[PDB]
RNA sequence: AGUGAUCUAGAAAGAGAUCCACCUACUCAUGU
């Protein structure tokens, strides 16, 4: 949606009255995978940080503020935004980053398109005078403006790509022939390249949710033994087994995102929840979550909680056998 | 690709003197032998006084028919300062009683008793003449550099000896080795005659690291050995330049404790300004360093010389026969080259020889002596079959190359036309005989007046006869391209040969113009010898000069009336790809490839240097391949 | 050591190192008991003639100041026993003091002579004997301490005596075939009596 | 010289073919 409407969306208020609705539909389609909606157990955090942190790695467009004016005004006349509606508000002030931040738009895209593709044929022009082949070792900052984008005169494939023509309405014409098409219908990235880099993203994203401490003081990172965080980073459906147990295979990596943000989902900040405790162990949960309370019989099957405490109490024994003439 | 990048950016936006020399002191012993023996052997050493003497005592010893003697000389430095010095030294007009020969410049006379020639020239007197019958002795001269010419004229001459028992016939070595020479020409006799004496040191282990290690040798000597310049030997000009840059930045930094040192390069390429810097002197408080290739082994002196390294590796030609292809190897070298680079300390004083391999690997790994197992033989087989040599596969040859290159040449003549299937001359191949060319360059040529263009195609294989012409230095290579691209043609750089030669023809320069639009004069000059020399053979063999009024689709199809085998089609998935062998090869990174017609070139070289390069690329239209030698052409045989 | 992706080694547009601000360092080291560390923070009124409030919010009755603060955590927050004096612990101290103010097998299995009169108990694994503190001279994963006694520092164990004993056998077997089907046979495990007895043999 | 406008929130049983963007890439002639 925002690398083809880049720009359009900031004028657009259905738009983006669909974009926050519609993230909250994704954070609810989340959140009712795991039987609880609550704002105080699902953080920002849990989110959008990324995938490789362990996160779902959702990209904003919907902390937001929706421009909102006056409804019997803004029908008749191009009102000034004169007031904000709240997007998406969370008890916590995270500013979430949004995505449209980090595209450049395309007024800002075709200037600048204009400024690089005049400046290859000024140096196209000068290497033909200066009889030597253009290398594209010079090419680089140039690298990636404009559109379409100067990496593609330098990919391996220019010459088979030389006779390939009428490719736009091919890829356009997928949508009468495909059952899944791409949404990127209209772009392709051997004649056009990547229209947009959004690596810069997710850093932004990581230094908006109170960098890598606060994000992991909200997962189970602690209570896993790694002697530095650094070292953090399904065979069965290929299998035929059944129709109905391909859904214990898509529950299975539910399980891990659940357990990885465990500590805040199962969080003490309820605004209403009982305190059930789990079978044969001393967790409390705040709710029947199930994904949550399978992982924690999971973790503490054969009474290993048990098998803990029992532990520390026989081995305090041990200290208390080692330490007699002492005490 | 081109295409591509356009439609994108559509898309986007006195007499005494001469006495003391070694070999008056044995020129009794020297008349014995030639006197009893049709065939003899003599080896020296090299200033012994064999090229100028020898051949003087032949003159007296044999004297008065209507006859002369050759002496012959892989070397056409070597044949014409040698003859200006005998002619000198009998006292006799050079030109007359002593005289040259070499390709495209001759300086004899119907007067001319001696007669100091190139081998390829006695060699090409013998196709006009398969007797020699107008000698009565000859003598081939350092017989030890076993070139193809002199090789193919020791086989030629052992069967005419048995034709003229009044031919005698005189074998000159510097290689003291004649057991070899001696067998070969039926057990003849031998006759073994001022280099001080070389110490010779060895490494107690292999080297695998001689660049490095010779950099080293050459501190060391400069400081620890009293005075007297250093030879290294090494195998070409990026490598000679790299270790010239960091020996004398090695030096300088020794000269906080140590003499002054001034190295110099030498190598083929070399412009002559710098070729003359090797001989300056050796500062003042100091020393001297030339870093030479192979040319410095025998095809020179530098008058100072008492220490040579030896890393014992040169870059030579190898011609694999059933692959059918040349290539230029860094290789190990002969014990007789060895030998040569180790008697150039000693022409000053006693010396030194400093050899980066072990003692056992000179006596026992070392090939004895290195040209007929490292050649292309279509010029070679030519020459037998215009020399009557019907059975090739029996001439007896010192060391019989493979029956497979010799059937490989036969094909190759046979698709040239110069044989018929039935391996027997045609006219074509006599008259492509007549002339000092490869037969590709030969055939071209004859065929040139029928593609209206024979003076354009003189030009072109004139200039295809000497070396590059262009000088690109590696501070100015943007001024010297500039220069360059004021002849270039832009799918065809033989075009590019005419047009450079042209303008050097122009009726506005001389040396200067050469140095100022980059031109080897030298070259240049050679070229228009090599010019007038051939079409003197033209005129003599009526092949009509002819032009048109501007056509280079003519030109192109004549170079490919000669060298239709060497061409090589773009690929249209990958790079470029040879007609013959179905190689897979670049463009030369000489030339730019106008990727629009360009779909066929055809190649003057094959250039191997750790990739596959095809050198002087001229565009080709495929038809005319097609009708130009349809028995090439045929698939069917492909 | 890139596992870290693209984006975490960017930096920010200002100045790895970066993000080391739970801690991102060791965390094998298990965090200490922190805790109770305490603050207590700080017209007129008709009722009492104090200032700052008014009559609707007085404290004394109509007639005609510390707290618990400095909040950040949630823990910290509801903390029945925030402030302590040990009221309640005293009282219970005081309740303890007034409730504390108020045959012959035996000697027939002393004939051997003893005359003393769910894990073992009496296991002591050597981490509880490792007390003291060392860099981890105990693994939970292998479960294996180490010594200078069967102990290295990447490391093994130490072979002593019949692990001595294979390693001069594999030495035998790895010299009898650098020295001497038969093509297999050159080693200890293939043909094992073989080396056996030819190292028994060798011995005489 | 700027205040002010803050929805959600979870339990039981049942359902469910997933089908798609986050790492760049090319310069020896040993001779004549
Ligand atoms: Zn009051």
């Known amino acids: 949606l925002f690398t083809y409407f880049r720009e359009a969306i900031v004028a657009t208020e259905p738009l983006l009255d669909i974009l926050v609705k519609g993230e909250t539909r994704i954070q609810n389609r989340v959140k009712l995978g795991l039987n609880s909606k609550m704002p105080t157990r699902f953080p920002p955090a849990v989110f959008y940080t990324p995938k490789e942190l362990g996160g779902l790695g959702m990209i904003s467009a919907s902390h937001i503020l929706i421009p909102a004016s006056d409804l019997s005004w803004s029908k008749q006349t191009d009102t000034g935004i004169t007031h904000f509606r709240a997007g998406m508000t969370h008890e916590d002030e995270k500013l979430i980053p949004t995505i449209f931040r980090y595209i450049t738009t395309w007024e800002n895209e075709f200037l600048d398109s204009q400024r690089v593709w005049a400046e290859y044929a000024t140096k196209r022009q000068e290497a033909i005078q200066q009889n030597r082949?253009?290398?594209?070792?010079?090419?680089?900052?140039?690298?990636?403006?404009?559109?379409?984008?100067?990496?593609?005169?330098?990919?391996?494939?220019?010459?088979?790509?030389?006779?390939?023509?009428?490719?736009?309405?091919?890829?356009?014409?997928?949508?009468?022939?495909?059952?899944?098409?791409?949404?990127?219908?209209?772009?392709?990235?051997?004649?056009?390249?990547?229209?947009?880099?959004?690596?810069?993203?997710?850093?932004?994203?990581?230094?908006?949710?109170?960098?890598?401490?606060?994000?992991?003081?909200?997962?189970?990172?602690?209570?896993?033994?790694?002697?530095?965080?650094?070292?953090?980073?399904?065979?069965?459906?290929?299998?035929?087994?059944?129709?109905?147990?391909?859904?214990?295979?898509?529950?299975?990596?539910?399980?891990?995102?659940?357990?990885?943000?465990?500590?805040?989902?199962?969080?003490?900040?309820?605004?209403?929840?009982?305190?059930?405790?789990?079978?044969?162990?001393?967790?409390?949960?705040?709710?029947?979550?199930?994904?949550?309370?399978?992982?924690?019989?999971?973790?503490?099957?054969?009474?290993?909680?048990?098998?803990?405490?029992?532990?520390?109490?026989?081995?305090?024994?041990?200290?208390?056998?080692?330490?007699?003439?002492?005490? | 690709p081109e295409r591509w990048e356009i439609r994108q950016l559509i898309a986007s936006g006195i007499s005494a003197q001469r006495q003391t020399l070694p070999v008056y002191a044995m020129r009794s012993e020297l008349i014995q032998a030639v006197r009893d023996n049709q065939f003899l052997v003599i080896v020296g050493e090299t200033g012994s006084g064999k090229t100028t003497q020898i051949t003087q005592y032949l003159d007296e010893e044999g004297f008065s028919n209507y006859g002369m003697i050759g002496c012959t000389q892989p070397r056409r430095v070597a044949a014409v300062s040698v003859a200006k010095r005998v002619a000198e030294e009998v006292g006799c007009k050079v030109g007359h009683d002593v005289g040259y020969t070499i390709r495209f410049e001759d300086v004899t006379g119907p007067d001319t008793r001696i007669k100091y020639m190139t081998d390829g020239m006695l060699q090409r007197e013998a196709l006009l003449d398969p007797?020699?019958?107008?000698?009565?002795?000859?003598?081939?001269?350092?017989?030890?550099?076993?070139?193809?010419?002199?090789?193919?004229?020791?086989?030629?001459?052992?069967?005419?000896?048995?034709?003229?028992?009044?031919?005698?016939?005189?074998?000159?070595?510097?290689?003291?080795?004649?057991?070899?020479?001696?067998?070969?020409?039926?057990?003849?006799?031998?006759?073994?005659?001022?280099?001080?004496?070389?110490?010779?040191?060895?490494?107690?282990?292999?080297?695998?690291?001689?660049?490095?290690?010779?950099?080293?040798?050459?501190?060391?000597?400069?400081?620890?050995?009293?005075?007297?310049?250093?030879?290294?030997?090494?195998?070409?000009?990026?490598?000679?330049?790299?270790?010239?840059?960091?020996?004398?930045?090695?030096?300088?930094?020794?000269?906080?404790?140590?003499?002054?040192?001034?190295?110099?390069?030498?190598?083929?390429?070399?412009?002559?300004?710098?070729?003359?810097?090797?001989?300056?002197?050796?500062?003042?408080?100091?020393?001297?360093?030339?870093?030479?290739?192979?040319?410095?082994?025998?095809?020179?002196?530098?008058?100072?010389?008492?220490?040579?390294?030896?890393?014992?590796?040169?870059?030579?030609?190898?011609?694999?026969?059933?692959?059918?292809?040349?290539?230029?190897?860094?290789?190990?070298?002969?014990?007789?080259?060895?030998?040569?680079?180790?008697?150039?300390?000693?022409?000053?004083?006693?010396?030194?020889?400093?050899?980066?391999?072990?003692?056992?690997?000179?006596?026992?790994?070392?090939?004895?002596?290195?040209?007929?197992?490292?050649?292309?033989?279509?010029?070679?087989?030519?020459?037998?079959?215009?020399?009557?040599?019907?059975?090739?596969?029996?001439?007896?040859?010192?060391?019989?190359?493979?029956?497979?290159?010799?059937?490989?040449?036969?094909?190759?003549?046979?698709?040239?036309?110069?044989?018929?299937?039935?391996?027997?001359?045609?006219?074509?191949?006599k008259e492509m005989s007549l002339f000092p060319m490869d037969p590709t360059l030969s055939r071209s040529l004859l065929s040139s007046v029928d593609n209206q263009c024979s003076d354009e195609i003189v030009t072109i294989i004139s200039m295809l006869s000497v070396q590059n012409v262009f000088y690109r230095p590696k501070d100015r290579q943007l001024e010297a391209d500039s220069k360059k691209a004021k002849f270039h043609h832009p799918y065809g750089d033989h075009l590019t040969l005419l047009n450079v030669y042209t303008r050097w023809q122009q009726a506005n320069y001389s040396e200067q113009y050469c140095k100022t639009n980059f031109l080897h004069f030298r070259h240049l000059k050679r070229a228009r010898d090599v010019k007038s020399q051939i079409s003197m053979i033209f005129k003599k063999i009526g092949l009509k000069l002819i032009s048109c009024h501007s056509d280079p689709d003519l030109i192109r199809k004549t170079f490919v009336s000669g060298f239709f085998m060497n061409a090589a089609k773009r690929d249209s998935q990958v790079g470029y790809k040879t007609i013959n062998g179905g190689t897979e090869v670049g463009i030369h990174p000489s030339s730019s490839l106008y990727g629009k017609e360009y779909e066929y070139v055809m190649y003057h070289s094959i250039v191997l240097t750790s990739r596959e390069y095809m050198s002087q690329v001229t565009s080709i239209e495929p038809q005319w391949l097609l009708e130009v030698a349809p028995h090439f052409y045929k698939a069917g045989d492909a | 050591n890139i596992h870290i992706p693209r984006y975490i080694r960017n930096q920010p547009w200002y100045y790895l190192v970066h993000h080391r601000q739970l801690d991102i360092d060791n965390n094998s080291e298990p965090k200490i008991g922190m805790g109770i560390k305490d603050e207590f923070k700080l017209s007129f009124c008709r009722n009492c003639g104090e200032a700052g409030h008014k009559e609707k919010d007085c404290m004394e009755k109509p007639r005609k100041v510390l707290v618990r603060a400095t909040d950040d955590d949630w823990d910290s927050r509801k903390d029945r026993w925030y402030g302590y004096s040990g009221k309640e612990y005293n009282e219970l101290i005081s309740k303890w003091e007034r409730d504390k103010r108020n045959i012959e097998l035996m000697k027939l299995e002393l004939y051997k002579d003893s005359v003393g009169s769910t894990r073992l108990r009496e296991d002591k694994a050597a981490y509880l004997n490792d007390i003291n503190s060392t860099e981890s001279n105990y693994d939970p994963k292998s479960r294996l301490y180490k010594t200078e006694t069967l102990g290295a520092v990447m490391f093994r164990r130490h072979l002593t005596g019949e692990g001595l004993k294979l390693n001069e056998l594999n030495q035998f077997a790895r010299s009898h075939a650098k020295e001497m089907k038969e093509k297999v046979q050159h080693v200890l495990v293939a043909n094992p009596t073989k080396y056996e007895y030819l190292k028994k043999k060798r011995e005489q």
């Open chain 2, 131 to 429: 007797e020699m019958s107008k000698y009565s002795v000859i003598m081939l001269d350092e017989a030890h550099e076993r070139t193809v010419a002199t090789d193919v004229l020791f086989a030629l001459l052992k069967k005419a000896a048995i034709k003229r028992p009044e031919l005698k016939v005189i074998v000159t070595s510097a290689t003291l080795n004649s057991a070899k020479f001696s067998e070969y020409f039926l057990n003849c006799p031998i006759i073994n005659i001022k280099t001080f004496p070389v110490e010779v040191l060895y490494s107690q282990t292999p080297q695998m690291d001689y660049i490095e290690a010779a950099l080293d040798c050459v501190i060391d000597i400069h400081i620890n050995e009293g005075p007297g310049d250093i030879l290294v030997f090494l195998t070409g000009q990026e490598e000679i330049d790299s270790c010239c840059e960091i020996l004398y930045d090695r030096v300088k930094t020794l000269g906080d404790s140590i003499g002054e040192l001034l190295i110099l390069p030498v190598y083929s390429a070399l412009p002559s300004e710098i070729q003359s810097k090797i001989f300056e002197p050796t500062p003042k408080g100091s020393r001297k360093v030339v870093f030479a290739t192979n040319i410095a082994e025998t095809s020179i002196t530098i008058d100072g010389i008492y220490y040579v390294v030896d890393p014992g590796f040169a870059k030579i030609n190898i011609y694999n026969a059933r692959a059918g292809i040349e290539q230029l190897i860094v290789s190990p070298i002969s014990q007789a080259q060895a030998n040569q680079r180790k008697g150039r300390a000693g022409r000053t004083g006693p010396g030194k020889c400093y050899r980066l391999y072990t003692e056992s690997a000179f006596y026992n790994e070392m090939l004895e002596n290195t040209e007929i197992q490292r050649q292309n033989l279509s010029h070679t087989i030519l020459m037998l079959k215009a020399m009557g040599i019907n059975d090739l596969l029996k001439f007896d040859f010192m060391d019989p190359p493979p029956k497979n290159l010799m059937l490989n040449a036969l094909t190759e003549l046979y698709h040239l036309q110069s044989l018929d299937d039935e391996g027997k001359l045609t006219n074509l191949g």
């Open chain 1, 133 to 327: 082949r253009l290398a594209f070792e010079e090419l680089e900052g140039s690298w990636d403006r404009g559109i379409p984008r100067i990496s593609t005169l330098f990919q391996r494939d220019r010459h088979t790509l030389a006779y390939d023509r009428g490719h736009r309405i091919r890829r356009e014409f997928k949508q009468y022939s495909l059952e899944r098409n791409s949404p990127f219908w209209w772009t392709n990235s051997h004649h056009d390249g990547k229209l947009w880099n959004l690596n810069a993203y997710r850093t932004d994203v990581i230094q908006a949710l109170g960098g890598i401490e606060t994000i992991l003081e909200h997962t189970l990172f602690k209570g896993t033994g790694f002697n530095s965080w650094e070292g953090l980073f399904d065979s069965m459906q290929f299998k035929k087994l059944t129709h109905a147990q391909r859904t214990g295979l898509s529950q299975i990596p539910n399980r891990r995102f659940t357990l990885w943000w465990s500590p805040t989902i199962n969080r003490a900040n309820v605004y209403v929840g009982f305190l059930v405790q789990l079978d044969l162990t001393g967790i409390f949960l705040h709710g029947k979550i199930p994904t949550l309370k399978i992982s924690l019989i999971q973790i503490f099957r054969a009474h290993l909680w048990q098998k803990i405490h029992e532990s520390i109490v026989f081995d305090i024994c041990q200290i208390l056998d080692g330490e007699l003439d002492v005490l």
